[PDB]
Amino acid sequence: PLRMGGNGQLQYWPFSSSDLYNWKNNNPSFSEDPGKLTALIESVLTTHQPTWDDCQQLLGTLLTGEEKQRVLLEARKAVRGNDGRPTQLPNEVDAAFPLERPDWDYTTQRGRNHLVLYRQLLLAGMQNAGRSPTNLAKVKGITQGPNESPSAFLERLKEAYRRYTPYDPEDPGQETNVSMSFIWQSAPDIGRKLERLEDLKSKTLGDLVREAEKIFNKRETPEEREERIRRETEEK
Amino acid sequence: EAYRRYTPYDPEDPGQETNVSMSFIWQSAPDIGRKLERLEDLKSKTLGDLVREAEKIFNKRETPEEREERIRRETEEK
Amino acid sequence: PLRMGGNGQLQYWPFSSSDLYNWKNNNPSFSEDPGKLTALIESVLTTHQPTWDDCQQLLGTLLTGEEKQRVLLEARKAVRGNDGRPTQLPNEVDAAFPLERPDWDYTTQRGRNHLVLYRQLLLAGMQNAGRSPTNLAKVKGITQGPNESPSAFLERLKEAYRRYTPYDPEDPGQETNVSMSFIWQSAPDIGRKLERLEDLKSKTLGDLVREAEKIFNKRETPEEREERIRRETEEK
Amino acid sequence: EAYRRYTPYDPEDPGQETNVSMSFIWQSAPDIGRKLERLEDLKSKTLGDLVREAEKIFNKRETPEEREERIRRETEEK
Amino acid sequence: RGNDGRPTQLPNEVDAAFPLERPDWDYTTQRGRNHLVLYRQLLLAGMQNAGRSPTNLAKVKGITQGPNESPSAFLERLK
């Protein structure tokens, strides 16, 4: 880690192994749920200002050999030339994201800039490495749970679009597509009512969530239902 | 036809293409849908592309006669 | 450990025993899997900038008596004379990798250079000691498991090359060699398809892994298979 | 050779190519013939093309040893 | 190749270098000899390029030393 010392100069100290192992032990593996470790590492990359060696310890400790490899190749694939476009030119790729220890000196603006870029690319690598290619079945498999709010369900549905399709669920051109999955895969009472909405074509995704909440928010409390039953007085 | 009759969305609109495409993939016959889902650069496939890819699988129907012949020539007993 | 202080001067502090014991407890023994501790120590040698005494604590804590001995003799065998060749001259060996506390002063360029070299040789020692006499049968014995991903299998295969051969599986000159083992020892369905690839000679190790993943990723779910069987409707 | 010996047609004549091609497809081994028949743009295939396509199938012979190994690893009992 | 060292599909050039019908090349003349040299060179090139034998790694893995087979004989079959 690096921090600005009291004398206006960067100061280095190695990661405590307790931090590294705590981060590992309090999160799922990268493969299980890439978002967890990616968010943790994104944070640490900022607060701990790791050097290249520090990043090797992070990756080496939190990822398996196969995960780290995926991340490193993904990071190198994220390198851009001075024209802002991808580049596979060995010298450019190596200069941005070196696989072997670089001579970056954190006391120099040159060293610092490389470190900044390295960390940015590392993050990109992790973000991209966490992609279950395309698998539409995963999107169709997101079904609202019986206690799950419509907004929570929609967020899980969008997460599946992100992970398992090439479509961005936040794109304006995807709205009807996400809307149809939302209606079809909502809890059955909700989906049947959303399907019956007047001027359904006119409903935004936000509108549909609000309409589903009205039904959900009409959950008819268990206690209430039980009370009704008791006061049923209809015998057989 | 179902989009036309039972939704306000025109399935021929350019803005509906991904929507119709997703229904097409999801509701195709299971062998076809599983293969369309696995297409490389799926995001880049038009509705016309998806139909052509599905036809390749369908057109690989593996004739009933052919299948039966294979079974006969199976020679694997139990 | 040493770090550059806020005053531009190296600053020393002893290892926290919690770090040493955490490193030990979160890894296999050196004998079980030398790569684990070797990678951890390689990292620490950089981030913690250990002195000679610090290195003795590292080794003393993470390795058994027999492992440490192997490593130390391997490190001394890695010493090079000024002509870049191996040397068994006692004075040269002792000067580079002393078995007893040296008078190295980290506040001097002389002391620092010796420390750098010492750490480099220590790493070399570990890398070579983790070199279980050459045993090609161990490499041929790495076979992809029925649930094992191609990338996970390749990492195990590379680990066997490292431990049981003198060949570095990451060398460009070893690529076809590792590729052939990868094809031959992949799961049978995968190996048969990789063998049939068009322009096979042109496939990199990375290409082969991606092609194997396409087959693996076509795993044909157990549920799916069962469903197919049920819908079989072919009786006897 | 059979065309030469037992017909008046020269199998190397450009005007005989489709004729020889059809015999080649029809009289190839059954697995090969069925696949050649299914080739896309079959009309466009020369005799040389057809031979190369048949070689791809033949060259996919699925070694006896390989087949046996598969069977052994079958683990499906009856 | 044409005189500019590049490929050519010009019938007259192709025919002149590698004729499909008997040419009038006279081996007692430097002209005839040079054409013969070129013809042979092109014939070799043709064979080299027509080659391109389909790959099949299973065939290489299938070469196993026989119980009576000497190591050098086995190595030659493997090669």
Which CA distances in Å does A219 have to A185, A228, B33?
A: 18, 14, 36
On chain D, the residues whose CB falls within 8 A of the CB of C188 are: 66, 69-70, 73
Q: What length is written for chain A?
A: 236
On chain E, the residues whose CB falls within 8 A of the CB of D55 are: 54
Give the span between the Cα atoms of A156 and A145, in whole angstroms: 11
What are all long-range contacts of C11-17, with beta carbons under 8 Å and residues at least 24 apart? C12/C51, C12/C106, C14/C54, C14/C57, C15/C48, C15/C50, C15/C54, C15/C57, C15/C58, C16/A16
Q: Do chains B and E touch (3 or more CB pairs under 8 A)?
A: no
Answer yes or no: are the C-beta atoms of C1 and C40 closer than 8 Å: no
A210: closest CA of chain B, how far (Å) = 20
Instruction: Say if residue C150 is exposed, middle or buried (CB neighbours under 10 Å; 0-12, 13-18, 19+).
Output: buried
Give the span between the Cα atoms of B13 and B19, in whole angstroms: 10
Which CA distances in Å does A124 have to A41, B40, E8?
A: 11, 22, 49
On chain D, the residues whose CB falls within 8 A of the CB of E62 are: 63, 65
Tokens found for residue D35: 């696949």
Tokens found for residue B30: 């299971």
C183: closest CA of chain D, how far (Å) = 14
Q: Which amino acid is at E21?
A: E
CA C48 to chain centre: 20
Coil/strand/helix, residue E36: helix
Q: Write out the E strands in chain A.
A: 2-4, 10-12
Q: What share of chain D is helix, strand, coil (3-state, %, to 5)?
A: 65, 0, 35
Q: Do chains A and C touch (3 or more CB pairs under 8 A)?
A: yes
Q: Do chains D and A touch (3 or more CB pairs under 8 A)?
A: no
On chain D, the residues whose CB falls within 8 A of the CB of E58 are: 63, 66
**Beta A10-12 vs C10-12: how paired, if at all?**
unpaired
B window 21-60, beta carbon within 8 A of C: 38
- With CB atoms and an 8 Å threshold, state whether A136 touches B43: no
* DSSP states along C176-236: HHHHHHHHHHS-HHHHHHHHT-TTGGG--HHHHHHHHHHHHTT---HHHHHHHHHTT----
CA angle C211, C212, C213 (to 5 degrees): 90
**Substitution target from B23, B37, B53 for chain A, most A beta carbons within 10 A:** B37
Which CA distances in Å does C90 have to A223, C69, C76, C80, D39?
A: 87, 17, 10, 12, 75
Tokens found for residue C122: 């220590």
Closest to A6 (Cα-Cα) out of B47, C7, C197, E22: C7
Give the span between the Cα atoms of E18 and E38, in whole angstroms: 8
On chain C, the residues whose CB falls within 8 A of the CB of B71 are: 234
- With CB atoms and an 8 Å threshold, state whether C188 touches D60: no
Tokens found for residue B41: 């650069």
D23: closest CA of chain C, how far (Å) = 28
- With CB atoms and an 8 Å threshold, state whether D55 touches E58: no
Instruction: Say if residue E50 is exposed, middle or buried (CB neighbours under 10 Å; 0-12, 13-18, 19+).
Output: exposed
On chain A, the residues whose CB falls within 8 A of the CB of C155 are: 65-66, 69
- Identify the helix (H) or strand (E) that includes residue C22: helix C17-25
> Could you tell me if C201 lies within 8 Å of chain E, comparing CB atoms?
yes
Instruction: Say if residue A53 is exposed, middle or buried (CB neighbours under 10 Å; 0-12, 13-18, 19+).
Output: buried
Give the span between the Cα atoms of A207 and A214, in whole angstroms: 11
Q: What is the resolution of this structure in A?
A: 8.6
